[model samples]
Each structure stands twice: as structure tokens, then as C-alpha cells.
Target chain A: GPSPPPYPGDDAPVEDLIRFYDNLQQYLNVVTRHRY
Target chain B: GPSPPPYPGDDAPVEDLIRFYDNLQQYLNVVTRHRY
Candidate 1:
């Protein structure tokens, strides 16, 4: 399974994950740098 | 996983796949149907 995005759960769509976070700008920056 | 049948190892017939078993003959279905 994928590490949750923004960071914990399955690799669901961005909208589904935003529900758990406060700021997405930093999260997006963090996620955009993921290794293959 | 079940890569053998699904791709190489299992050699499983369509009967074991989730949906490939039915409608194969009319489509002349086989893995060969893939355009690749």
C-alpha cells in the first residue's frame, strides 16, 4: 500500500486526502517530491 | 501474486480470471487480443 498522502492511507485521489489536512500547499510540495 | 496465470507463471485459463471466461469465443479472445 502507498504511504498516506499529504502523508497515511491508500493512494486515493487528492480530494479525498485533503479532508484530513490543514494546509495543502506544503503537503503538495512534500508529495510532489516522492521517489519512484 | 498470481502473476503466473495472469501473465506468465500460473498458466491459468480464463476460467480463473475475474471476467475473461465469458464472451471470449465471440471476441476470439485470448491474450493475443491485446494490440501490443
Candidate 2:
């Protein structure tokens, strides 16, 4: 298993942050594409 | 300590997801408010 990140927050881990950022980026891309 | 979310995803944790969503929402609101 991968090592854990520092504590207290849910996405405190690096992996989680990367995943979330990618998903957020994808979402933004879709929104922007639809908007303009 | 806060519980960790699943593996291999940034913002996989509930708190992180929430944070991202809230921030995204806030950002969108700002953008939309200024929309012409």
C-alpha cells in the first residue's frame, strides 16, 4: 500500500490531492467547453 | 485523528472533496457574478 500523508484533513495525502485536482480540472474543462 | 479516504485519488477523502467543491462553488460564483 502507499504511504499516508500528514494528518487532520481527508485529502491530506498526496495521492488524494492529485486525484481531486485531476477530477476538478476535468470538470472545469467540461464546463468551460460548454460555456464558450 | 481524521480517517483516511480510499487509495489512489486526490481529494478522495470526504473533507477534501467537500473543500474542493466549496472552493469551486465560490470560484464559479465569482466568475458568474461578473459574467456579461
Candidate 3:
């Protein structure tokens, strides 16, 4: 997918991408629980 | 708000939080742009 841009910080480093991807996925895991 | 947990990287440092917060906000800005 293409990158998100136009506000700021879309130029994140690969490490930050890994970090955010890691944390964001972790967020979603709990988010997926008990959504009824 | 409380932090999300139970997967991994939920314990990110404040700097990474700012980094993720920064990048994520940028992401949302572009997202908010084209979603009508």
C-alpha cells in the first residue's frame, strides 16, 4: 500500500514503522476482543 | 486514557509514543482527506 501523508511524519524511519506496526497491531489485538 | 496491552510493545517509551502519535496523526490527516 502507499504511504499516508500530507500532515506530517509520514517520512517515518523503517524502525519507527516497525515500532508503530508492532504497537498498532498490539492495539488492534485487544481491540478485536469483545466488540459486541 | 489507559494503554492497550496483552500483545507486544504496549510498553513503548514516551518518545516512541510521541513518534507513533505523530506518525499516526499524520496518517489520519490523509485518511480524513479522502473519506468524504
Best by TM-score: 3
Tens digit of lDDT per residue, candidate 3, span A1-36? 122222214344544544555555455434344211
Between candidates 2 and 3, which one is better according to lDDT?
2
Instruction: Give the TM-score (vs. native) of candidate 3.
Output: 0.34
Candidate 1: CAPRI quality band: incorrect
Give the distance in Å from residue B15's predicted Cα in candidate 3 to where it truly belongs: 0.6
lDDT of 1 by residue, A1-36 (tens): 112223332332333333322232233335444321
Best candidate according to lDDT = 2
**Chain B TM-score, structure 3:** 0.58
TM-score of candidate 2 relative to the true fold: 0.31
List per-model TM-scores for chain B: 0.18, 0.51, 0.58
Candidate 2 lDDT score at position A31: 42
Model 2 regions lying over 4 Å from their true place: A1-11, A34-36, B1-36
How well does candidate 3 score on lDDT at residue B13?
A: 48
Which consecutive 10 residues in model 1 chain A have the weakest lDDT in total?
A1-10
lDDT of 1 at B29: 23
Error in Å for residue A15 of model 2: 1.0
